[PDB]
Amino acid sequence: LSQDFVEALKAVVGSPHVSTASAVREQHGHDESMHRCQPPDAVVWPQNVDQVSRVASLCYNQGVPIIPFGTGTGVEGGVCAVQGGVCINLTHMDQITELNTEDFSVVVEPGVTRKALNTHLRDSGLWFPVDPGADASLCGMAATGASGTNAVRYGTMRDNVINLEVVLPDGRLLHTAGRGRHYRKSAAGYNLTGLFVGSEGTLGIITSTTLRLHPAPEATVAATCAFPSVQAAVDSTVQILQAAVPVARIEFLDDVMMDACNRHSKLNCPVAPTLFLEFHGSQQTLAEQLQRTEAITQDNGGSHFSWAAEKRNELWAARHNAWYAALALSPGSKAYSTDVCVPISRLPEILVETKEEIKASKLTGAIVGHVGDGNFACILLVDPDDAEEQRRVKAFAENLGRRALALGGTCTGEHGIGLGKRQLLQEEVGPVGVETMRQLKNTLDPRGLMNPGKVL
Numbered sequence: 451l452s453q454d455f456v457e458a459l460k461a462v463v464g465s466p467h468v469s470t471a472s473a474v475r476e477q478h479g480h481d482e483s484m485h486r487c488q489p490p491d492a493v494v495w496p497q498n499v500d501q502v503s504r505v506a507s508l509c510y511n512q513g514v515p516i517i518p519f520g521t522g523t524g525v526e527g528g529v530c531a532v533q534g535g536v537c538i539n540l541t542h543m544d545q546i547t548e549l550n551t552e553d554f555s556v557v558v559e560p561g562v563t564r565k566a567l568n569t570h571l572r573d574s575g576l577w578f579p580v581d582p583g584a585d586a587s588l589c590g591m592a593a594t595g596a597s598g599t600n601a602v603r604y605g606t607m608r609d610n611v612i613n614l615e616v617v618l619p620d621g622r623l624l625h626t627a628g629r630g631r632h633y634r635k636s637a638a639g640y641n642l643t644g645l646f647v648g649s650e651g652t653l654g655i656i657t658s659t660t661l662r663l664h665p666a667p668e669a670t671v672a673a674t675c676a677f678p679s680v681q682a683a684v685d686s687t688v689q690i691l692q693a694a695v696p697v698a699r700i701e702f703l704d705d706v707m708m709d710a711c712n713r714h715s716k717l718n719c720p721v722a723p724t725l726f727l728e729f730h731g732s733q734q735t736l737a738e739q740l741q742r743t744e745a746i747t748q749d750n751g752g753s754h755f756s757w758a759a760e761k762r763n764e765l766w767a768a769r770h771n772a773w774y775a776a777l778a779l780s781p782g783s784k785a786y787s788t789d790v791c792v793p794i795s796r797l798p799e800i801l802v803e804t805k806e807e808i809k810a811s812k813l814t815g816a817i818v819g820h821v822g823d824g825n826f827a828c829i830l831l832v833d834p835d836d837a838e839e840q841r842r843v844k845a846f847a848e849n850l851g852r853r854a855l856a857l858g859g860t861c862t863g864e865h866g867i868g869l870g871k872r873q874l875l876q877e878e879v880g881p882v883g884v885e886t887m888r889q890l891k892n893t894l895d896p897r898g899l900m901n902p903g904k905v906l
């Protein structure tokens with residue numbers, strides 16, 4: 451990367467906001483996944499959208515790859531600079547704007563996390579519900595198509611992103627639904643907002659997101675329920691969903707994950723396949739939701755509910771940190787995560803089969819999951835230096851993905867494709883789906899410089 455080019459970057463964002471130092475690049479060459487660190491050639495921190503546009507145009511016209519970088523908490527290698535180039539760290543644009551509490555909407559820049567937004571919204575009676583366990587950039591969450599424990603009731607990012615501000619690869623500025631617009635529904639033209647949600651930085655750079663806000667629940671009750679078997683816990687989940695109980699949260703932990711979370715959070719739950727549950731409503735609604743849900747869990751051998759503001763906070767903090775709880779089982783290990791999502795009636799088959807397949811392997815695994823969506827993660831620890839173990843973990847994850855595809859499901863419910871699921875995506879949507887996706891990629895990024903090597 452030439453000295454003239456570096457000086458041109460500094461001319462846009464300022465000398466302190468460009469770095470070619472090896473340590474700084476290495477810190478931006480990886481995410482939380484096991485994918486090998488591939489450092490960009492430079493890291494740049496634009497201070498406003500005009501600077502994002504000018505950095506993108508400079509890179510694009512010089513043939514330099516662009517890698518958008520939020521908080522680096524992704525798990526599929528999205529920020530790995532597989533072809534080098536310029537990593538654009540977006541987090542210095544950190545302003546919340548256009549808060550419209552009467553319309554239940556707000557605009558956030560990439561440096562805003564969900565924690566920051568919900569802190570800014572306390573005493574408003576509103577909150578933003580989509581809750582990945584990591585303190586992630588909300589624009590990064592839009593880019594990956596994230597969900598969370600609350601999505602079963604309140605929707606994923608796709609459900610709650612109403613507009614996006616996107617710097618296209620050559621620097622043009624697009625407001626996907628129109629500048630300043632926010633509304634509940636539209637049939638106006640083609641829906642561009644949904645194309646950029648889940649695009650993982652391969653179609654453009656999200657520089658603001660317009661988010662749907664939700665009313666805080668009148669009353670909240672959380673609980674845990676221990677089961678004799680994985681089958682019993684997942685059967686309960688399916689029956690709760692088929693009974694249309696509007697649960698706010700329904701999260702599965704297998705016994706390995708329960709124990710890991712116990713050790714990492716000083717919860718003391720019975721070591722068993724467990725549901726973490728949360729219910730929102732009035733006192734009257736909660737009582738009948740609880741009655742109908744305990745009746746179903748009881749039918750499948752569930753324990754009486756162990757009830758949980760501060761004890762609920764500890765419960766969900768433990769759940770949100772499950773990834774780190776699993777990593778702490780074998781210190782020094784990295785890990786890969788699966789993320790399949792299947793039609794809910796097939797969820798018992800594939801979860802039970804996954805448990806059995808983990809047991810029959812010398813692989814260690816923990817299972818945790820947004821099972822209310824038919825989604826779960828298998829967390830597979832890896833010795834970073836054991837090449838034979840990594841091959842077995844990859845083979846396991848690929849076979850699980852293919853089993854989900856055989857059941858009519860998807861290889862990723864929320865994490866995305868990045869570097870790890872590109873072959874599974876080709877199987878999932880077939881040749882016409884792949885070509886159509888690639889045609890969209892090519893019209894927005896003709897030179898192939900917008901996060902190359904990812905998704906497609």
Ligand SMILES: Cc1cc2nc3c(=O)[nH]c(=O)nc-3n(C[C@H](O)[C@H](O)[C@H](O)COP(=O)(O)OP(=O)(O)OC[C@H]3O[C@@H](n4cnc5c(N)ncnc54)[C@H](O)[C@@H]3O)c2cc1C
Nearest residue numbers: 520521522523524528582583590591593596597651656864
């Ligand atoms: C402990 C833990 C728990 C998690 N729980 C969940 C969960 O429940 N659900 C879930 O969905 N994910 C979860 N995640 C994964 C991760 O937090 C999400 O994928 C999150 O959306 C990533 O955001 P980020 O800004 O950190 O992404 P990064 O790693 O910085 O980037 C992810 C991808 O998006 C692109 N990108 C980032 N920002 C932008 C932008 N502004 N414009 C365009 N492209 C961009 C990058 O180029 C990359 O390809 C978890 C991660 C951890 C570590």
Ligand SMILES: CCCC[C@@H](O)C(=O)O
Nearest residue numbers: 525583770772773787827
């Ligand atoms: C870190 C990614 C694996 C686990 C995450 O999806 C979660 O549900 O907490």
